[PDB]
């Protein structure tokens, strides 16, 4: 543990083998500054002033997700370990802001203990998919190399509504549904 | 103005298999001290780090040996690697994100008292300090000139 | 923008005097500071390299130094022989993108036996 | 010894038509490969560093639509076309990414002949 008034991790390139999968991230004081889409080849900033204020070449991440695939494959051959075994997640559902009925809001569900990262959160409102309005975030690294990540729900809080968040995972036998409603305390 | 990065080295050379590396800088009073530490992980064991307070990649697991060593006996990349203190750590933190997060401030708004939406962190019972993920925080702030 | 800028040229020198060929460089980086030369009918080599500001660099009697305060990295050499008759290459790095070279112009320079 | 091969060295590159160059690395422990134009006046100018097999990247510049593959761990490619300018294309190479030596190949001389 390094005490310090700031961390910036500058960055952080996490692969998987199957599936050749990749993600690229810079953060600052634990709150993503961009990911880089690898597909496109393109910065995504989280908040866009930001990325209307500084840049960053996209091929910086480009090159480190080569870097660490390379890696990933000596290792792999190299070692005769274990693979390490898949976690099960877990799921917090709270709003952004305070409930205000009518008041347009952001349902947050903040999902722990992710590993590997490899995951699907998808939400429901009265027992019914809901893919508008949904947004997440990249897997963010945890201190004991698991990881953690956000999904968004902007929605109208009324009386009557029962949201769930559910979640799908390597390390779970039933996927997980975490409930909120708009009297509900967390 | 333009970010700079941290460069990862390179190994020498069914199951599923996760790696990762992190290029972390550590500040204090700004940049008066930058402690500055790179960690290899393979498989949820971080197996070699460099560490700006040692000077020189170490095993952190038996497995990096061979890495450790390898990156250390190699003048440029250890060099390049050593210098990321000042051509990484320190120029984000005074070019950069004195543009970007250094400047973040976004006012808190106030059987209680919802202190929300609030950038950055510091700030009869309120639960502890919530992370929003999107540059926020929910729970007297530096957005403030006067602390109803 | 992060450029090079050095001596347009073409230089001639009688062997045995001194070279002088400018560089100035511009960039908010931390960058590594670098010569090329290129021999004729041969591709560009590395001639040296600085990566710490305000340091020296040398080789093959050449030599500059990485001047942060003055943006410079002037190449010198005291004594010019007949087989550096060559084009010079100006060159910096930063640590972005794919971590590559942003070249000058290059100043070529013909030495008289 | 060297490093690097690169077939061909001249070519004459009639309009509307395509060129396609190899970079062949003589030498796996120098891994990162990648392609500088050198444009007729002497100015180069890197294009692409692409170390992985199955890597493609397009770029177009002023004289010239690039197409760059790495097709193996040894073999480097380039297809050049809408040429309007000729140019000379160098294929480097380095032990690491970005690394303090390229190593410059002997190049491949374009023209565009009317």
């Known amino acids: 543990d390094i005490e310090a008034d700031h961390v910036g991790t500058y960055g952080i390139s996490v692969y998987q083998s199957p599936g050749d999968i990749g993600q690229y991230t810079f953060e600052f004081d634990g709150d993503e500054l961009f990911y880089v889409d690898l597909d496109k080849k393109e910065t995504v900033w989280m908040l866009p002033e930001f990325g209307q204020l500084a840049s960053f070449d996209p091929q910086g991440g480009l090159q480190n997700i080569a870097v660490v695939k390379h890696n990933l494959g000596v290792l792999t051959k190299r070692s005769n370990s274990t693979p390490a075994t898949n976690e099960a997640p877990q799921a917090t559902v709270f709003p952004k802001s305070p409930v205000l009925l009518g008041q347009p809001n952001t349902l947050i569900c903040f999902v722990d203990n992710i590993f590997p990262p490899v995951i699907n959160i998808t939400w429901l409102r009265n027992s019914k998919s809901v893919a508008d309005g949904v947004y997440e975030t990249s897997f963010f690294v945890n201190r004991d190399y698991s990881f953690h990540k956000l999904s968004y729900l902007t929605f109208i809080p009324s009386d009557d509504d029962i949201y769930d968040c559910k979640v799908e995972h390597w390390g779970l036998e039933e996927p997980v549904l975490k409930h909120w409603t708009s009297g509900l305390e967390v | 103005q333009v970010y700079s990065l941290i460069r990862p080295n390179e190994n020498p050379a069914e199951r599923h298999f996760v790696y990762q590396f992190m290029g972390e800088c550590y500040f204090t009073n700004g940049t008066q001290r930058i402690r500055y530490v790179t960690r290899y992980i393979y498989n949820r064991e971080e197996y070699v780090r460099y560490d700006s307070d040692v000077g020189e990649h170490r095993a952190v697991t038996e497995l990096g040996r061979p890495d450790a060593e390898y990156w250390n006996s190699q003048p440029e990349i250890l060099e390049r690697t050593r210098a990321e203190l000042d051509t990484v750590c320190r120029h984000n933190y005074e070019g950069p994100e004195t543009h970007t997060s250094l400047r973040r401030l976004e006012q808190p708004n106030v059987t209680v008292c919802s202190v929300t939406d609030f950038y950055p962190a510091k700030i009869v019972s309120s639960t502890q300090l919530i992370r929003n993920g999107d540059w926020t925080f929910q729970v007297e702030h530096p957005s403030l000139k006067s602390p109803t | 923008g992060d450029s090079v800028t050095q001596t347009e040229g073409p230089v001639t020198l009688s062997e045995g005097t001194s070279l002088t060929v400018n560089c100035s460089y511009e960039?908010?980086?931390?960058?590594?500071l670098f010569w090329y030369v290129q021999y004729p009918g041969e591709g560009p080599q590395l001639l040296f390299k600085?990566?710490?500001?305000?340091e020296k660099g040398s080789s093959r009697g050449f030599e500059a130094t990485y001047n942060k305060e003055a943006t410079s990295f002037h190449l010198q050499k005291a004594s010019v022989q007949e087989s550096d008759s060559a084009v010079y290459y100006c060159?910096?790095?930063?640590?972005?993108?794919?971590?590559?070279?942003?070249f000058g112009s290059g100043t070529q320079l013909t030495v008289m036996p | 010894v060297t490093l690097l091969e690169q077939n061909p060295r001249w070519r004459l590159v009639p309009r509307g038509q395509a060129v396609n160059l190899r970079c062949i690395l003589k030498?796996?422990?120098?891994?990162?490969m990648s392609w500088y134009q050198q444009d007729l006046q002497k100015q180069l100018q890197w294009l692409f560093t692409?170390?992985?097999?199955?890597?493609?990247?397009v770029k177009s510049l002023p004289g010239a639509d690039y197409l760059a593959t790495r097709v193996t761990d040894t073999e480097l490619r380039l297809q050049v076309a809408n040429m309007s300018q000729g140019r000379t294309l160098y294929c480097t190479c380095?032990?690491?990414?970005?690394?303090?030596?390229?190593?410059f190949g002997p190049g491949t001389r374009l023209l565009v002949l009317e």
């Open positions: 380095s032990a690491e990414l970005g690394g303090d030596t390229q190593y």
């Open positions: 960039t908010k980086q931390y960058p590594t």
């Open positions: 600085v990566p710490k500001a305000n």
């Open positions: 060159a910096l790095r930063i640590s972005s993108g794919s971590w590559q070279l942003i």
């Open positions: 030498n796996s422990q120098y891994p990162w």
């Open positions: 692409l170390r992985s097999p199955g890597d493609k990247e």
